[PDB]
Amino acid sequence: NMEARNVMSGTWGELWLDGNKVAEVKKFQAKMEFTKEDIIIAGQMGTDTKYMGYKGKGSITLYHVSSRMHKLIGEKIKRGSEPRFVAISKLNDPDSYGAERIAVKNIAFDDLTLADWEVGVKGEIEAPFTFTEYDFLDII
Amino acid sequence: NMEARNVMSGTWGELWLDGNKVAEVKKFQAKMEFTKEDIIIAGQMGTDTKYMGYKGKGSITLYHVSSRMHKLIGEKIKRGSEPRFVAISKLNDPDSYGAERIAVKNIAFDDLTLADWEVGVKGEIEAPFTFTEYDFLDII
Amino acid sequence: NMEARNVMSGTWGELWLDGNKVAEVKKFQAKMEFTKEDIIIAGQMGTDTKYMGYKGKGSITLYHVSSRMHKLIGEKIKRGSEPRFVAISKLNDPDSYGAERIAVKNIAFDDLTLADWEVGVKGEIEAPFTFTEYDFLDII
Amino acid sequence: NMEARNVMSGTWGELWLDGNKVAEVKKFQAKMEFTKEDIIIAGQMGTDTKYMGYKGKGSITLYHVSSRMHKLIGEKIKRGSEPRFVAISKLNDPDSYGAERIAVKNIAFDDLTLADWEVGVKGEIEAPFTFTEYDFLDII
Amino acid sequence: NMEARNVMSGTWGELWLDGNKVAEVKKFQAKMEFTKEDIIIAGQMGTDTKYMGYKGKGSITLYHVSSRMHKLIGEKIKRGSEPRFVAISKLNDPDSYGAERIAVKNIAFDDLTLADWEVGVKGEIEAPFTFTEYDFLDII
Amino acid sequence: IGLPSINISFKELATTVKERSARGIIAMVLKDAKALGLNEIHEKEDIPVDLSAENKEYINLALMGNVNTPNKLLVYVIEGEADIQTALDFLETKEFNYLCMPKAVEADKTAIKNWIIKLRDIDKVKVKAVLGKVVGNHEGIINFTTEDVLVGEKKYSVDEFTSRVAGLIAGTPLSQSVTYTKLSDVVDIPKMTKVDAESRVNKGELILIKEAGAIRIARGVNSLTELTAEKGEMFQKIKIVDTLDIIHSDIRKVIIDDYIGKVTNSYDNKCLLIVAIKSYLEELEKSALIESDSTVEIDFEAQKSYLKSKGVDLSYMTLQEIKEANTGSKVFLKAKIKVLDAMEDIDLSIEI
Amino acid sequence: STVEIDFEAQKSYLKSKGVDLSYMTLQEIKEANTGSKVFLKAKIKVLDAMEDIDLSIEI
Amino acid sequence: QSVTYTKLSDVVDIPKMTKVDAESRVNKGELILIKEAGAIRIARGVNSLTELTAEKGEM
Amino acid sequence: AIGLPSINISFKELATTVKERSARGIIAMVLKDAKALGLNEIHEKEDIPVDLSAENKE
């Protein structure tokens, strides 16, 4: 049942940000980090852990073709009002079993890049973010 | 007695997680870290140590073919209920002396990966965990 | 709509510093770092964040052809009076959609290089700075 | 039968003040301090004690999102009329054996914070109090 | 003959309170403080002391998994009746010479913690007490 | 849906019922001319009115529990003039721990003894009975021989007090034992000497003894009297046999529910089964029913004997090859545990 | 599992057709003409499910 | 999977029938229903074959 | 001789250990007795011919 062709290729990924399709995505990332506390129990040599909560962290990397992030956050950040966004990522490799589609909610970005260029180097933008909620659509 | 053929190859490894066989496994790891305290004894130049307990730590890496970890932990983590699992690893090289089979118990994972893809890069997943107990079956 | 030709090349960048064009720019950079505070809310597993402010940081790298920075800041720094500058960057690739022109204001430099040379090595200068304000002119 | 999962996490707490739920509650505690008198008995080397009474003490901390305490006590305190309140605290961790609910009665606050703010720092309010009675609901 | 292995580790402790084992015990200690009077003898430069008695003090800390202390003392304390208890502490490290067991009698607790919880932090309870007598079982 | 109802009612105090027990299921057979069938009796209040008052008193005696009321009472009613085997056939279908039948005759007792011995030995089902006057050597048969128990100015025969004994046994928790358990309701017992008590307890009877204060049970022994190398003195105690039966029932339920026919017989699946059984044993260890340091393993000798029986050549075979060989549909396993006993005898020497 | 030409059935058919099988190589017999008949043999292995379990417990 | 110990919920009652008789009947080779803990379930998953030869064995 | 499914769980106690039997050595041995003539090949203590006397058994 397992074959090398069943591994998903990242070239078949798609991204929607704030309801708008971004054709220029290089990579997408989203992950939840658990908070754990060590608990030593009397009479037991192996120490145990208690689950307490989690952190969502991610990043988006995209080719520099337009001023998407400027228009999204630049003017509102200065005024003191922070916006929140929703992203949808889809991974659909024709040679795999099926598709994987996840919605990431309550996204707050970490920074804003105004200019970053070098002579003889093509432009790219990296945007880390945090999040709180998510949903599952079409899991395998 | 030793021949270079007697070294175990990692291609002959197998893994069961929560009673289910996983075929797209890349590496498995499990290790116990001891806690030690320095004790200086009067009249002795060499300082000694006292054993206090241990930490079990491990990780699993697998090719991205299905949503195994999502189905395992995603919905329960949000509600505040943490699950525990049992894993069995077997290493059986035909050119070695025998097999090695260990059960790792009370496994709690460290994080959950929702999406991680890149254009022109094949997908992979890394899942660290901790544990407390283990058993021996068929040691060499 | 996207063609690989639409990615902006950094060779098509231009920089004005204190109203004077610098022909010798290697790279220009400007970025805003947000300050965030973790907030744990009762009854919620996913911890949230509160936006508090931002840091602007950047840098300029240029070929060593003249004493621009010496004349700009050297004599005033010793006397105890710190100057502030305005920079304008333009990125205009003929194969892209349009131009991107940003003015960075209230620039304070981090250091001053008096001499840095090596035998068999051509000269270059790196100048980090901080800033507070910015404006948008001709965004895409 | 002690397990690490059974330890109660404080993120599952809830508070009711004067019949109204407070969502922004950060911390809650209540304690009874016993009053004891030393007694020395002839022919007995070890000193004994006599129990005479108790005094209840507690504290509340909230995120600064509204003027709740002002509306609660401010105008009344000026005129010379002191109000008493009832507070209900609930701690219900899904991984624990059960819920714990206690009602704290005859609460008198110690002070009133009109304003406490700091540039670059988020707002918090701490309110100590004293009480006299309590009741048990859903004991474990 | 002193060895590092012979030092007693506190993970091997055990506690019995009022005849019932407490699995969630974290800390136990008990101590007798002697009362001394300074005496100055004529013709003697160094001051001497006279022993007059002692006072016993101790403390217990447990992981918050149940309402044990509430059921122990809460209702009785309100009505004006003070209960006394007996505690047995056992310390038996496999690498040590032997076990050590002590019974602490006529225990009177100092306070009662109704509630102490914190978002993002696990629950713990600290309970000081005073005692009068003790007995030796399995001394080393 | 009617008008809103806000009713505040005043009443006097009412008596508190004893707490129900999660453990302990007892089945009783009653003979009444009316209302035949199986009835599940949870509480003392819910009893069908068709039964006679005497059957009601037997039920009520069975209801009372030593520390807690038994979890559930299964009553099968037969009119009479019928073979007992027809009620035993229906009782084979249900699940129960103890079997008692107050209205008994010698042939009926022999039938019950044979039926339970056959079940335990061949049917591989662990059940027990409390019988009046039976000399059966098995651990599944409890022999209680006390004559003329008087409760509340009444006379109860030896055969019809077994319901009370069964209720007492079912009410006892696992950590404790029935030795020296006192019965407050019982008033008077016929006179009897101590040497006779020693002789009877050595013989294997569960009798009543009169001590300082109320009446109490002397010892909690079984009817087993003949010992072998395999069956020692441990098996004569009710508590140990009870915990062993609980372990047997739990493991059998797990195996039947999850493994018979469901999974293929391969060495990996055997390892999975071993891990599951080890986890169950650890769970038992945490509850302090059994001592720590219990193990589960593949039974190598039985597997090798089975391979020899089928004509497989064991020459030039590695130990791993023998251990991992195909065994058709059979699985051979072995385990090891340890159980403690209660406190019953104390010697205290005082120097003056 | 193995798949191969059924040698015994092919030889039986060759005898039934009057062909002589003596002084013939194994390879010669394997690729001989057999009209409209094809004879093949395959060898596979199957396992049973768990039906009986023995557990020995020592106290 | 197999059909051994497969429970039939619809079936309610079977005639009284002894265990040793069931052993003998399945030894001859028969599919029968047995009474067991819980519902009514299939005793064994054998078929009618009872001749044992070198060509066809126990499997 | 197939039969009904068998699920037995047995309780027991006090097993014992034995001596390991090795495949190392071969010994040639001569005995005199008036019955069971010819060579005799023995691997274990249980497959001994009952024909030989106790003195020959020693």
HEC states along chain E? CCCHHHCCCHHHEEEEECCEECCCEEEEEEEEEEEEEEECCCCCCCCEEEEEEEEEEEEEEEECCCCHHHHHHHHHHHHCCCCCEEEEEEECCCCCCCCEEEEEEEEEECEEEEEEEECCEECEEEEEEEECEEEEECCC
Q: Do B88 and F279 touch (CB under 8 A)?
A: no
Beta pairing, strands B100-109 & B124-131: antiparallel
Using a CB-CB cut-off of 8 Å, the residues of chain A touching D4 are: 39, 41, 48-50
CA dist D127 and D116 (Å) reads 13
Element (H, E) at F63: helix F53-63
How many angstroms separate the first and last alpha carbons of chain C? 15
Q: Closest chain C residue to B81 measured between Cα atoms?
A: C45
Q: Which two tokens stand for residue D79?
A: 């005129």
CA distance F272 to F267: 9
In chain I, which residues have their Cβ closer than 8 Å to the Cβ of H22? Answer: 4
Nearest to F230 among I5, I8, I13 (CB): I13
Q: Say if residues F133 and F108 touch (Cβ distance below 8 Å).
A: no
| DSSP label of D24 | T
- Nearest Cα of chain I lies from the Cα of H10 at a distance, in angstroms, of 23
**Cα A86 to Cα A127, A132, B79, distances in angstroms:** 15, 11, 21
| F contact set with H (CB within 8 A) | 89, 92-93, 95, 122-123, 125, 256, 260-262, 328
Proportion of chain F in helix, strand, coil states, percent, rounded to 5: 35, 15, 50
In angstroms, the first-to-last Cα distance of chain A is 15
Helix (H, G, I), strand (E, B) or coil at F247: helix
Contacts of G among chains (3+ CB pairs under 8 A): F, H, I
Number of H helices, E strands in chain F: 9, 11
Instruction: State the smallest CA–CA distance between residue A43 and chain E in angstroms.
Output: 5
> Under DSSP, is residue A36 helix (H, G, I), strand (E, B) or coil?
strand
d(CA F300, CA E131): 59
Q: Report d(CA D135, CA C133) in Å as an integer.
A: 58
User: Which of these, B35, B30, B4, B27, lies nearest to B125 by C-alpha position?
Assistant: B27
CA distance A79 to chain B (A): 33
Distance CA F285, CA F243 (A): 13
Q: How far apart are CA D67 and CA D75, in angstroms?
A: 13
Does the beta-carbon distance from H1 to F89 stay under 8 Å? no
Amino acid symbol at F308: K
With a CB cutoff of 8 Å and minimum separation 6, the contacts of F87 are: F29, F76, F78
Interstrand relation of F295-298 and F330-336 (parallel, antiparallel or unpaired): antiparallel
| Cβ contact D5–A41 (<8 Å) | no
In the Cβ-directed half-sphere of C56, how many Cα atoms lie within 13 Å? 20
Provide, as residue numbers in chain B, all residues whose Cβ is less than 8 Å from the Cβ of A45. Answer: 53-54
Q: Please say whether the beta carbons of F333 and G53 come within 8 A.
A: yes
I30 part of contact set with chain H, CB < 8 Å: no
Region at B43 (left for phi over 0; alpha for psi -120 to 50; beta for the rest): left
A41/D2 CB distance under 8 A: yes
Query: Which residues are A124's β-sheet partners?
Result: A63
Q: Identify the residue whose tokens are 């160094």.
A: E46
Chains that touch H (3 or more CB pairs under 8 A): F, G, I
Residue recorded with tokens 């044992």? H52
Beta carbons within 8 Å of I24's beta carbon, 6+ residues apart: none
Cα four-point dihedral sign A107, A110, A115, A121: negative
d(C-alpha F64, C-alpha F59), whole Å = 9
**Dihedral sign (CA F96, F100, F103, F109):** positive
F173 within 8 A of F216, measured Cβ to Cβ: no
- Residue I20: is it exposed, middle or buried by C-beta count within 10 angstroms (0-12/13-18/19+)? exposed
Nearest to H16 among F89, F125, F260 (CB): F89
Resolution of the PDB structure in angstroms: 2.7
Contact H6, F261 (CB under 8 A): yes
C-alpha distances out from residue C99 to A119, C23, C26, C30, Å = 16, 18, 19, 17
Nearest in space to B15 (alpha carbons), one of B96, B103, B77, B82: B103
Chain E's closest residue to C45, CA to CA, is E120
Hey, are the CB atoms on E109 and D36 less than 8 Å from each other?
no
Contact C113, C37 (CB under 8 A): no
Judged by CB atoms closer than 8 Å, whether chains meet at G48 and F329 is answered as: yes
Answer whether F197's CB lies under 8 Å from F166's CB: no
Q: Which of I7, I8, I13 sits opposite G59 (nearest CB)?
A: I13
**Residues C88-92: contacts with CB within 8 Å, 24+ apart?**
C88/C15, C88/C16, C89/A115, C89/A117, C89/C13, C89/C14, C89/C15, C89/C16, C89/C28, C89/C30, C90/C13, C90/C14, C90/C15, C91/A115, C91/A117, C91/A123, C91/C8, C91/C10, C91/C12, C91/C13, C91/C14, C92/C12, C92/C14
* D11 → chain A, closest CA residue: A52
Dihedral sign for Cα C71, C72, C73, C79, please: positive
B30 in reach of chain F (CB within 8 A): no
| Closest CB from F272, F320, F323 relative to B19 | F272
Query: Hey, of B137, B139, B140, which one would you mutate to test binding to chain F, going by the most F CBs within 10 A of its CB?
Result: B137
Strands A13-17 and A85-91: antiparallel
Pairing mode of beta strands E13-17, E85-91 = antiparallel
Beta carbons within 10 angstroms of residue E68's beta carbon: 18
Contact B101 F271 (CB under 8 A): yes
Report CB contact under 8 Å: D120, C35.
Answer: yes
- Please count the other Cβ atoms lying within 10 Å of the Cβ belonging to residue D101: 18
Element spanning F280, H or E = helix F267-286
Name the phi and psi angles at B79, rounded to 5.
Answer: -75, -15
CA distance H6 to D83: 71
DSSP structure class, residue F311 = T
